[PDB]
Amino acid sequence: MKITVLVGGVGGARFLLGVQNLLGLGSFADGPSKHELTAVVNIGDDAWMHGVRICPDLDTCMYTLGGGIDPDRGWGHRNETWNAKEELAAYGVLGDRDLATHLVRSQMLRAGYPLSQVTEALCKRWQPGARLLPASDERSETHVVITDPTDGERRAIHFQEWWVRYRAKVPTHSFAYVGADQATAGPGVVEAIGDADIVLLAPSNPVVSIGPILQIPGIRGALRSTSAPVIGYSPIIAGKPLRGMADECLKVIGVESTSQAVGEFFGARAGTGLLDGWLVHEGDHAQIEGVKVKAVPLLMTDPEATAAMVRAGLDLAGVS
Amino acid sequence: MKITVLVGGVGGARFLLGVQNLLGLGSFADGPSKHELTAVVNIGDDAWMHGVRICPDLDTCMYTLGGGIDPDRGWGHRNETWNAKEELAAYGVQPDWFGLGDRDLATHLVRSQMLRAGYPLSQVTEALCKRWQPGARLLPASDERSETHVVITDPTDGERRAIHFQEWWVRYRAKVPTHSFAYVGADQATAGPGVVEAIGDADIVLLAPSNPVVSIGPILQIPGIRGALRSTSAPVIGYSPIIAGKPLRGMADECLKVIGVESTSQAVGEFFGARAGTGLLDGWLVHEGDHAQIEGVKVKAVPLLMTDPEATAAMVRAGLDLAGVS
Ligand SMILES: Nc1nc2c(ncn2[C@@H]2O[C@H](COP(=O)(O)OP(=O)(O)O)[C@@H](O)[C@H]2O)c(=O)[nH]1
Ligand SMILES: Nc1nc2c(ncn2[C@@H]2O[C@H](COP(=O)(O)OP(=O)(O)O)[C@@H](O)[C@H]2O)c(=O)[nH]1
Ligand SMILES: O=c1nc2n(C[C@H](O)[C@H](O)[C@H](O)CO)c3cc(O)ccc3cc-2c(=O)[nH]1
Ligand SMILES: [Ca+2]
Ligand SMILES: [Ca+2]
Ligand SMILES: [Ca+2]
Ligand SMILES: [Ca+2]
């Protein structure tokens, strides 16, 4: 009755919604449920900005599961304004509702509360119906090393600045996980991975959403050691118009945007890797030595479809 | 050439506007500027709230002179929204009694981040003023902390408590029994950069008709500042903030009562005193129809309503004239 999912980004929040729907948790609860959902949430995008601490993935899971996301925009609060952002532009340097979260979190961190407890405190308001554990209570911020065009020097940029400003506009060389080597697995993270009935890798971006969770010392070891089946979900959805575009962050590490490539990225637990099973969308193929591969529908069209997706993860692992 | 004015918030900014219109400064600039206006701004109301630093007096002048102030509120931005404040309420956090506007919050965020990175307030203020272009030099009385505290009888328990000015003013609206003010940090605060010099090199120094106990007073509590006023060669002209028989914006009467000073122009004048003896004033202007005696102080009844920048401009002229300054 214990399921733990590693997540990052909007897609992670959507996958958790499916988990909740299948198991009657959170918004989808009819009576008190038989299951506990634990999310090990990416902190690689977290940043100090404008004197306040911003944790996008933890916030996106919290708001999404708490039913606070705007149905028509898909991101951000309902009836959001960006007046504070507007004045910040005028000052020459982030919704208003979003800022309140930031002020509260910042006040807690500066008063000594670790992020895990900041998160629990915010979740008393949102009541996501899930345990959202930050991968780490220490800093571990995903950066991108570019060739800077002012002087030609390699520089590390915060992933967030890279994504808006520099992506596809200057040469990019690698990712750096700033602070990761000095970070420890956040409270409960190794325990949540060790005691689970099943561990699911959400179909988030493998490099910058699941990937940085894996750079936290202790987390990768937990995954290799745990007796819970580990089932990963492919993030590659073929069949789009013009056959889609390759993933920009997989490009940075020279990894093809195929279910086969992302699968080899995580690799087989039978070997040095992390996966016992690997789900791909129907019509897609992957053969990976040691890894059970199955094509099923993998579109998170709504919680009902994601619930089917989660159900197929249990079945491949053989978990009830 | 050089005018230095001690100011609070809404009233100091309003008086400062009069200075600007009289001299063709800031928003009122019509051709080459012949004058330099320096404001020494009260920092006694400054407070940390929700993890961000609030400087209401500096902000209100900054917003007012820069054409951003809320016309009917007198504090905070025009067309302000309060969604961020609303969300703080929804999270159930404290204090829920202090209005952090969404537009206003950006100032607080930029200011808080710069101070935390070691920038002194004076530099934060100049930086913020590059966007607003107030047309005046807004000097914090000090780059160090000097916050007015209020000794009340707390209505929860009947106990004596000290509260920050913000809680006295915003939460209780000065309606709790009030016993004294403490200028916590003033004796340890150094006069801000340029403040003593602006007082010394001024052709004239003007005390805006701001709140005497909680707006001008706390400036005068910074050790360096009071000496500059006494030791300066520029005449010091004060404006009574009390228009006897006419209630005015703010709680000046309540603040005067705490320090046991009658709400009359003569009493406020004597509060500040005469430079001939132990005081600070050379001159002291009051509203027409008001009589005031101050030994050592030239007192002149003149119109004293800040109804508009043109009317205030005349008020400024009457100080120059009483000082004998051109
Ligand atoms: N398999 C699968 N992957 C998806 C679906 N929707 C989105 N994704 C993947 O989710 C990734 C983006 O999600 P995420 O890592 O959470 O970061 P985000 O950019 O903030 O949304 C994309 O690279 C997609 O490949 C879906 O329905 N199925
Ligand atoms: N003489 C005079 N004083 C005024 C007038 N309008 C407001 N005041 C005074 O100015 C004070 C407010 O200025 P200040 O203390 O800087 O504003 P605050 O800090 O925002 O309260 C009030 O307490 C009033 O007594 C006016 O027209 N004439
Ligand atoms: O009465 C109020 N005055 C508010 N003021 C005015 C200020 O608190 C006091 O009027 C001054 O301290 C005294 O003049 C603010 C000033 C700021 O710079 C920033 C925020 C506020 C918020 C309030 C408020 O919520 N209620
Ligand atoms: Ca298609
Ligand atoms: Ca004030
Ligand atoms: Ca000091
Ligand atoms: Ca004293």
Author numbering:
A (entry chain A): 1 to 93, 100 to 326
B (entry chain B): 1 to 326
From the paper:
F420 is a low-potential redox cofactor used by diverse bacteria and archaea. In mycobacteria, this cofactor has multiple roles, including adaptation to redox stress, cell wall biosynthesis, and activation of the clinical antitubercular prodrugs pretomanid and delamanid. To determine the structural basis of dehydro-F420-0 production, we solved high-resolution crystal structures of the enzyme responsible (FbiA) in apo-, substrate-, and product-bound forms. The crystal structure of FbiA shows that this enzyme employs a flexible active site to capture Fo and EPPG, precisely positioning them for catalysis.
However, the glycerol molecule and one of the H2O molecules observed in the GDP-only structure are displaced by the ribosyl chain of Fo, resulting in a coordination number of six with octahedral geometry. Determination of the fully resolved FbiA substrate complex, in the presence of a single catalytic metal ion, provides a clear picture of the mechanism of catalysis of this enzyme. In this structure, the terminal hydroxyl group of Fo is ideally positioned for nucleophilic attack of the β-phosphate of EPPG, strongly suggesting that DH-F420-0 biosynthesis occurs through direct transfer of PEP to Fo, via a pentavalent phosphate intermediate that is stabilized by the catalytic metal ion. As no acidic side chains are present in proximity of the terminal hydroxyl of Fo in our structure of FbiA, it is likely that deprotonation of this group for nucleophilic attack is EPPG induced, possibly by the PEP carboxyl moiety.
